[PDB]
């Protein structure tokens, strides 16, 4: 039965790609502090096998922690491009979600969806360190639930 | 015929780990993706640019510093020569001009990078 | 704790002994359970070559003993 | 004596590599000649027979040489057994 | 047979490589005052996995400005030289006993950097690039200095037979009379693995990933094995030159779980290393070689010729 | 008031002398780092189990809006 | 067919040779010269010298990684040349890869050719020793030779290394 067969090959495949994120050294401001007390001891992101690499041709997550201004978007855009797939993004803080504090300034972009798809938003300003990793279970629960092969099978 | 064959397992199995890297996944190719990376922007200039060295100098002194030990390697062998006076002498001596030379340029400042 | 860190070393342990522990397996089942002979230099080899042909199964690992001389 | 002791004490402080470096290598220039073991290399290596020892003829006047390996004449390694 | 020996030396390898990315994410995390992966299968034990499966189902590219035969070629080179590496190693029989042994080593080291420069610079890309220099710049700094430190162990082994120094240290470990050696050799493997402190040719916080920035997925994987492989080779290489195990011919088992826990805790060291200290400026690695390293190499270079011959104690030839 | 955090002369006595070479040549001080490193791989982790384990928090804290009744 | 192991890889020895004398970017002749180093290895161990053959390997691999850096510093261009990318890198490279073809497929088809000078071919085992049996290697006991028969070799050569190092640094000392 190949329903079953590509069943099983959506779980692997799914559990692989959510068992090893590897975000984006990327960060924009004071989001990316409660970034970096994710990685430190008392959460271990690196325990969920989440792991930063700096080039975005060896990640998986973009995480917007912080701010994005528009001299800062076109840039933030390119390194998102030049994630191979699949990628993810998550949004980090009031500003990456909407623009947050700074939202009616000339020189903020309001939300980060603007400029590129986001998977998950994180509230807060900023999250906690634990709010944030709470977004990435919630991202990797949204990964085990993809149906890729389930629906190549069946078009 | 044992080593052609290690080496040839070795690099098959290097090449089709890598056919099926290429193969296996899901490909979305367009051109912002496959552009040069420089940290969010655009180069300035290309890569093939001239990369100044700074240690030129060095890099040329390592082509004849790694030509001795091509003739300090078959020491262990000489050392079952009979004609140990000989060979003794002659192996401190090359060692020693080694050091000489390394100290030459070494006083001369020619390890030192350009700035 | 740090003792946690083992279970990984266990398995990287079991993996590192294999190689080891085929090739030595490997040679004794292709040598009639002796070592393989070592030829570093031509003697060694002639030696192999006049075993094979005193053999008489064209295996240089076949000995011949007193019961082969009359 | 005190300037180069002044000097010995200083090279230790700046540039102590370089001082084991020079030690270490004086050592191998100068003690192979005070050795009393160096003599045996040369014996040791003059003792291996990477060739087969062509016999002589034997014309009827080399009485030093012997007939068969286990008589009394010859190179002896009793020497070399006790080393 | 030959073929199945070869397959079980390799397919081990790789698999002990990639359980060595786990050891080193638990060892780094536990002196890191935190615990590493240990979700992913109970104590992390299924975590390699999912990273191997993840990068092989990931999209390879291949960058516009990029030579694509040099590109591909290279992460070939790195793993098939990876693993070219270990067929001489007696363990304790070697699958390829070989009479240069060593020197075969030092060649197919020299040729593992091409993997490098022409990765960094079939790339074509400024941080590659650099990478790949750097890389130009480490092989100058150890490359002479390693040589003759493997040079002055050899006059006490008396030939380049790797089983030779298994017969060398029946008696005693090398490491006793060579332990300054053994020092300066313990550091040329760091620089020659490409090892913190002396991970230059990454260089993460500086070129934010070298000579392998522009690789993903299967590909990037490949260069990640050989690292790893060479990371514990070169370890082996260690304990069999200076920490030799005895050999009993009838129990060669005895011998290679001893030699296997040398190699392992060998290994753990450069992790230990890799935590403890800041990286080397890549011109002050060259300065550490050539104006430390080599003047001392020489003279014990120097030492190791008269020492045999004035105490009469030349090893054999054969 | 004041304090220098970089102003002192090493001693130039025999033993002072020798036993900054020997710091150069054996690596003590690098050593020493290392005994730190290791020191922390023999202690617990700071680590706790996330999400069966939480942060602690206080009632001051701020978190998701909500309107409330009498 | 593996008995012409040794004919093979002069194939692929001149294969290499034509990559580099072509002149392409230096970033491919030095690959040229590399491939060829190697299998110039591999030829000089089939005669017996395994030393010497690995020893030219290892030579010529610290020789064009230095060339290498050199390249991309002082012999580099916006677009370096390829084999395919110029009319005339192309023509000779074709040139002699077809010299080289032709030379191989007449040999091998007469067991013997003609080429100027007249070459047996029968495979290269025809001509080796057939009486061995020592226990020592003969190339390591000419190579170890050098210094208790070659001390006048010895002289001329270290002088030159050490005058090369002195010259090199006057020489770029603007
Ligand atoms: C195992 C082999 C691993 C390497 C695999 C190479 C193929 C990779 C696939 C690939 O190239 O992508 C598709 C690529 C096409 O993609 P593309 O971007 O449209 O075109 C790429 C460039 O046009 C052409 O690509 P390019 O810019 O890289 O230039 C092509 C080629 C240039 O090739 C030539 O100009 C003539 C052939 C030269 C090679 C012959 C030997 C040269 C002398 C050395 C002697 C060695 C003999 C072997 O470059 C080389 O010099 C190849 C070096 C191979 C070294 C092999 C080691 C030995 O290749 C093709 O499918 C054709
Ligand atoms: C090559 C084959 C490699 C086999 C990998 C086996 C994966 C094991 C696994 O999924 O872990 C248990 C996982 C663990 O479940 P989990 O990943 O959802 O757990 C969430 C994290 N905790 C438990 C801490 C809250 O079980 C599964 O979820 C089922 C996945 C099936 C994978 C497909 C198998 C075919
Ligand atoms: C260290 C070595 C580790 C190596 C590990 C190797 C991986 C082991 C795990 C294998 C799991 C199965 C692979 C599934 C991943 C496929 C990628 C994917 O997700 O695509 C989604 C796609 C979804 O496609 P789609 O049709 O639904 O839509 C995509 C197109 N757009 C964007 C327009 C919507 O799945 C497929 O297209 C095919 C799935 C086939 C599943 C069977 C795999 C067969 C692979 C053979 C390919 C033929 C080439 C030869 C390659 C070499 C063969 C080994
Ligand atoms: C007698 C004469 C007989 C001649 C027989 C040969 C005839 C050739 C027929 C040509 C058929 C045209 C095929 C076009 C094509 O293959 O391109 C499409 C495809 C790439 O994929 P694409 O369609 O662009 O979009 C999805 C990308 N993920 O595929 C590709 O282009 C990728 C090719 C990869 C290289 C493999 C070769
Ligand atoms: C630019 C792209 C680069 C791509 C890289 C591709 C991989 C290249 C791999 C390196 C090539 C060089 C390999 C040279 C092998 C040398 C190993 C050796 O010296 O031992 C091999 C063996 C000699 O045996 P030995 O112990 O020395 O003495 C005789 C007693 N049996 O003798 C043998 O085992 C037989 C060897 C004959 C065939 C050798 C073929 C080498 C030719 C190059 C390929
Ligand atoms: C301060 C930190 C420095 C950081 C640098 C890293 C250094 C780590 C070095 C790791 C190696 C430690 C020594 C290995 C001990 C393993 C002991 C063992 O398993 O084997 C037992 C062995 C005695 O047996 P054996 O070696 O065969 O006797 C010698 C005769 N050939 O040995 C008996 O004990
Ligand atoms: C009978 C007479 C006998 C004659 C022979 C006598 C010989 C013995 C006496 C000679 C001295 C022996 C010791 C020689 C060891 C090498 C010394 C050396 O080169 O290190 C010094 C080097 C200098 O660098 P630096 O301190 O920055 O300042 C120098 C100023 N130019 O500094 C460095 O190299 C620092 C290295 C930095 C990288 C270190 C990272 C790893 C540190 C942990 C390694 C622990 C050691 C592990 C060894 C394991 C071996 C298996
Ligand atoms: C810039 C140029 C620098 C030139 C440097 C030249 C350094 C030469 C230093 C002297 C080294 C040799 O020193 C010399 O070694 C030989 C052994 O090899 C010793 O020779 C001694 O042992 C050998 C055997 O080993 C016997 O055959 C010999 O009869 C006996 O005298 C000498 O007793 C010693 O005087
Ligand atoms: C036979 C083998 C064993 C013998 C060792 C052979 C190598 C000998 C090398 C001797 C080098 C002597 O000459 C060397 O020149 C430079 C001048 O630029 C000196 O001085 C310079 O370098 C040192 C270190 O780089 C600096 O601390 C110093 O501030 C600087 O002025 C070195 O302190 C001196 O060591
Ligand atoms: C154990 C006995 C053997 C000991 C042999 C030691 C030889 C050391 C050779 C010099 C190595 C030191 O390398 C460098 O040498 C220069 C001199 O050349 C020293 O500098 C020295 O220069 C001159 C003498 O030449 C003195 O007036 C000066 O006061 C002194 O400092 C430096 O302190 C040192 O940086
Ligand atoms: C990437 C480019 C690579 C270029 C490589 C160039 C290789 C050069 C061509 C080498 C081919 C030599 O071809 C070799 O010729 C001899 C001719 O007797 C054959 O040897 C033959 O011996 C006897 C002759 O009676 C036959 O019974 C046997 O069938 C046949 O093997 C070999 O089987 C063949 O392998
Ligand atoms: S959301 Fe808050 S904490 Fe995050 S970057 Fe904006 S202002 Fe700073």
Redesign the interface.
């Known amino acids: 039965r190949g329903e079953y067969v590509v069943a099983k090959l959506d779980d692997l495949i799914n559990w692989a790609r959510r068992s090893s994120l590897w975000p984006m050294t990327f960060g924009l401001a004071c989001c990316a502090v409660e970034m970096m007390h994710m990685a430190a001891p008392r959460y271990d992101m690196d325990r969920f096998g989440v792991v930063f690499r700096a080039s975005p041709r060896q990640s998986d997550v973009m995480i917007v922690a912080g701010t994005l201004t528009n001299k800062m978007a076109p840039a933030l855009r390119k390194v998102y491009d030049q994630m191979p797939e699949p990628r993810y993004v998550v949004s980090m803080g009031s500003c990456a979600n909407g623009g947050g504090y700074y939202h009616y300034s000339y020189s903020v972009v309001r939300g980060c969806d603007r400029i590129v798809p986001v998977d998950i938003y994180v509230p807060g300003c900023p999250p906690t360190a634990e709010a944030l990793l709470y977004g990435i279970l919630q991202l990797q629960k949204k990964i085990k639930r993809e149906k890729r092969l389930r629906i190549w099978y069946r078009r | ?1 044992n080593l052609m064959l290690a080496l040839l397992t070795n690099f098959t199995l290097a090449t089709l780990l890598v056919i099926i890297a290429f193969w296996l996944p899901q490909l979305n190719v367009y051109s912002e993706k496959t552009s040069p990376y420089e940290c969010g922007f655009d180069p300035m200039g ?1 890569a ?6 700074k240690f ?2 060095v ?6 510093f ?3 030990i ?2 300090l ?3 262990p ?2 050392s ?2 009979a ?1 140990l006076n ?2 003794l002498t ?2 401190l ?2 060692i020693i ?2 050091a ?2 390394l100290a ?2 070494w006083t ?1 400042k ?1 390890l030192e990078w350009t700035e | 704790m740090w003792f946690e860190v083992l279970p990984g070393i266990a398995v990287m342990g079991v993996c590192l002994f294999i190689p080891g522990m085929a090739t030595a397996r490997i040679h004794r089942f292709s040598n009639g359970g002796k070592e393989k002979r070592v030829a570093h ?3 060694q ?3 192999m070559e006049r075993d094979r042909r005193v053999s008489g199964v064209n295996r240089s690992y076949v000995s011949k003993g007193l019961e082969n001389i009359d | 004596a005190e300037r180069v002791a002044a000097f010995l004490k200083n090279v230790w402080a700046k540039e102590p590599v370089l001082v084991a470096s020079f030690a270490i290598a004086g050592l191998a220039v100068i003690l192979p000649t005070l050795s009393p073991y160096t003599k045996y290399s040369l014996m040791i290596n003059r003792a291996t027979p ?1 060739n087969y020892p062509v016999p002589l003829r034997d014309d009827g006047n080399m009485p030093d040489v012997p007939s068969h390996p286990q008589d009394p004449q010859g190179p002896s390694l009793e020497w070399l057994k006790r080393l | 047979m030959f073929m199945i020996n070869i397959l079980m030396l390799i397919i081990p390898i790789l698999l002990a490589v990639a359980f060595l990315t786990l050891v080193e994410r638990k060892v780094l995390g536990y002196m890191q005052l935190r615990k590493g992966p240990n979700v992913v299968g109970p104590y992390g034990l299924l975590q390699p996995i999912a990273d191997a499966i993840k990068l092989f189902i990931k999209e390879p590219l291949r960058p516009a400005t990029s ?1 694509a035969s040099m590109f591909i070629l290279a992460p070939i080179m790195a793993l098939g030289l990876a693993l070219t590496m270990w067929i001489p190693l007696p363990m304790p029989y070697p699958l390829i006993n070989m ?2 042994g060593v ?2 080593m ?2 197919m080291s ?2 593992a ?2 993997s490098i ?2 990765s960094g ?1 079939a790339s074509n890309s400024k941080y590659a ?1 650099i990478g ?2 750097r890389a ?1 710049a480490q ?2 700094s150890y ?1 002479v200095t390693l040589a003759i430190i493997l040079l002055s162990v050899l006059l006490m082994s008396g030939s380049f037979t790797l089983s030779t120094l298994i017969t060398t240290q029946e008696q005693m470990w090398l490491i006793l009379p060579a332990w300054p050696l053994a020092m300066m050799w313990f550091i040329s493997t760091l620089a020659e693995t490409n090892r913190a402190p002396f991970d230059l040719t990454e260089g993460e916080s500086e070129l934010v990933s070298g000579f392998n920035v522009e690789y993903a997925a299967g590909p990037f994987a490949l260069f990640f094995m050989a690292e790893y492989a060479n990371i514990i080779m070169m370890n082996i290489f260690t304990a069999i030159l200076f920490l030799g195990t005895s050999h009993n011919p009838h129990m060669p088992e005895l011998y290679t779980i001893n030699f296997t826990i040398k190699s392992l805790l060998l290994t753990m060291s450069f992790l230990w290393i890799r935590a403890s200290y800041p990286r080397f400026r890549y011109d002050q690695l060259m300065h550490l070689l050539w104006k430390n390293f080599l003047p001392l190499t020489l003279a014990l270079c120097m030492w190791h010729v008269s020492l045999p011959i004035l105490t009469s104690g030349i090893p054999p ?2 | 008031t004041y304090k220098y955090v970089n102003l002192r002369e090493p001693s130039m006595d025999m033993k002072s002398v020798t036993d900054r070479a020997a710091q150069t040549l054996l690596w003590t001080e690098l050593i020493r780092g290392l005994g730190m490193t290791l020191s922390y791989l023999f202690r617990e982790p700071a680590t706790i189990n996330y999400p069966f384990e939480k942060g602690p928090l206080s009632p001051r804290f701020r978190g998701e809006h909500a309107l409330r009744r009498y | 067919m ?1 008995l012409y192991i040794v004919f093979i890889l002069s194939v692929i020895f001149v294969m290499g040779f034509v990559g580099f004398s072509s002149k392409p970017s230096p ?1 491919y002749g030095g ?1 040229g010269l ?1 491939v060829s180093g ?1 299998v110039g ?1 591999g030829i000089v161990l089939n005669f017996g010298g ?2 010497l053959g ?2 030219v ?3 010529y ?3 064009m ?2 060339v ?3 390249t ?3 012999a ?5 040349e ?1 084999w395919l990318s110029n009319k005339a890198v192309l023509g000779a490279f074709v040139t002699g890869l077809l010299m080289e073809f032709f030379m191989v497929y007449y040999v091998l088809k007469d067991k013997e050719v003609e080429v100027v000078f007249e070459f047996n071919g029968l495979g290269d085992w025809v001509i080796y020793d057939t009486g ?6 003969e190339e ?2 000419g ?6 028969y070659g ?1 006048w070799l ?2 001329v ?3 030159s ?2 005058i ?3 010259v ?2 006057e020489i ?1 000392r603007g």
Do not use: H, K
Not at chain 2, 48 to 53: A, I, K
Not at chain 2, 59 to 64: E, K, N, S
Not at chain 7, 143 to 148: D, R, T, W
């Open positions: 015929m290309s093939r640019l001239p990369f100044s060295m030129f100098l890099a040329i002194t390592f082509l004849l790694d030509l001795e091509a003739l390697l078959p020491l062998w000489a079952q020569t004609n000989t060979m002659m192996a001596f090359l001009l080694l000489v030379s030459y340029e001369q020619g | 230099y031509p003697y080899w002639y030696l | 990477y | 030579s009479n240069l020197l075969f030092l060649a020299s040729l950097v091409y420069l022409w610079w690039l790949a220099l130009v092989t100058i490359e030839q054969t | 593996m970033i690959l590399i190697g290895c395994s030393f690995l020893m390997f290892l030579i691999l610290g020789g990684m230095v290498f850096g050199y991309t510093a002082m580099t261009e916006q677009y370096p390829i061995d049996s020592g226990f020592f290697s390591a006991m190579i170890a030779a050098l210094y208790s001390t010895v002289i050569t270290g002088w290394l050490l090369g190092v002195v090199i640094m770029t």
